[PDB]
Ligand binder design. Structure first.
Ligand SMILES: Cc1cc(C(=O)O)c(C)n1-c1cccc(Cl)c1
Ligand SMILES: *[C@@H]1O[C@H](CO)[C@@H](O)[C@H](O)[C@H]1NC(C)=O
Length: 351
């Protein structure tokens, strides 16, 4: 139900130089716009990107993209599947830059690949302004996994872009799903170095205030939610499993079958405690104590609850809290599990 539009500025490209693009379903009776950033890891050097080009080419090229995609979860237009924003204008931005949405580098005689994630977002926004975004009241920049980190890296730049273009009435907000990572110690050794190298390979850019804090050579710090979030001006709602599977993968943890012994038990409990600590001062957040790779464009995203409140409800409460900072009776926005082990929340996805 979302239709593909390749960017009219064909100099804003996927990794292989094919045009980037977006899928759009308009809702003419709505001034809400949801722009969703797809995830899918990243690649950080020629050989690693060449491998990704062989077997994950849709994440590097638009050449094989389908003409349409079905909106699911928060991108669904059915109220039963999407109690939160079913009537919004829906935009799905495919991830084809492999740069955690940070890149600003074109293909050239010096560069086999283009890493243009940050420019893709800017160009999608600019082209949508002529398709009705100019009349928006709220632009929610959402994303999952690498797209969630992409929200943190780009939401304030979208806000600044709209201000400079002359649209100060559009309220830009962020929804970062599964992109809030910890630069922690691995459970067993042999990841943040890949981000350091990636930023150089991609000509990656980070938000200005965060860049000014960490300074030259240390921009990798701004890929970590707990470091970049306090520098952001736009309202950002953070969704994060306490035991995210991608976090565990980079930590070299593989929970498969046999009894967990003391060292790994302590490691996992400490990970959840650390994650919960980083969210203590994040007033809009939803952080269930689950081991999951599941994301908010999944059809059953309504099922999980923290303290009896679902994510669509929490997001609705967030909308109410941003009406023109007293908390709302029965409508919470800060929902972080306190129980210390995966699936101690009974509503965790079963897989
Ligand atoms: C930046 C990023 C994106 C993704 C992803 O799963 O999409 C991951 C695991 N990271 C990450 C990269 C290095 C270290 C850490 Cl903790 C996290
Ligand atoms: C196309 O995008 C590039 C990179 O963002 C920009 O430099 C250029 O001005 C754009 N061209 C047009 C015609 O807008």
């Amino acid at each position: 139900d979302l239709r593909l539009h390749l960017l009219l500025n064909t100099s804003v490209t996927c990794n292989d130089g094919s045009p980037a693009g977006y899928y759009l379903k308009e809702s003419r009776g709505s001034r809400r716009w949801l722009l969703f950033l797809e995830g899918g890891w990243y690649c950080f050097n020629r050989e690693n990107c060449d491998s990704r080009y062989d077997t994950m080419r849709r994440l590097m090229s638009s050449r094989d993209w389908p003409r349409t995609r079905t909106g699911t979860g928060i991108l669904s237009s059915q109220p039963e599947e999407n109690p939160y924003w079913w009537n919004a204008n829906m935009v799905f931005i495919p991830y084809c830059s492999s740069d955690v949405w940070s890149g600003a580098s074109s293909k050239s005689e010096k560069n086999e690949y283009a890493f243009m994630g940050a420019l893709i977002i800017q160009e999608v926004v600019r082209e949508l302004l002529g398709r009705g975004l100019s009349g928006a009241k709220v632009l929610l920049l959402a994303g999952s996994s690498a797209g969630g980190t992409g929200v943190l890296l780009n939401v304030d730049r979208v806000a600044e872009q709209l201000e400079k273009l002359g649209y100060p009435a559009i309220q830009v907000r962020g929804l970062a799903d599964s992109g809030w990572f910890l630069d922690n110690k691995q459970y067993r050794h042999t990841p943040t170095e890949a981000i350091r190298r990636g930023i150089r390979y991609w000509n990656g850019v980070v938000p200005e205030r965060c860049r000014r804090q960490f300074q030259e050579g240390e921009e990798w710090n701004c890929f970590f939610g707990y470091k970049v979030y306090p520098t952001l001006r736009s309202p950002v709602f953070v969704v994060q499993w306490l035991f995210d599977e991608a976090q565990l993968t980079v930590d070299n943890v593989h929970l498969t079958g046999q009894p967990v012994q003391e060292g790994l038990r302590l490691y996992i409990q400490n990970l959840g405690r650390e994650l919960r600590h980083t969210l203590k001062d994040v007033p809009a957040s939803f952080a269930p104590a689950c081991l999951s790779h599941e994301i908010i464009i999944r059809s059953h995203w309504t099922d999980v609850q923290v303290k009896g409140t679902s994510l669509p409800r929490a997001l609705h409460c967030w909308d109410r809290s941003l009406h023109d900072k007293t908390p709302l009776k029965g409508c919470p926005v800060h929902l972080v599990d306190s129980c210390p082990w995966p699936h101690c929340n009974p509503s965790c996805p079963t897989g």
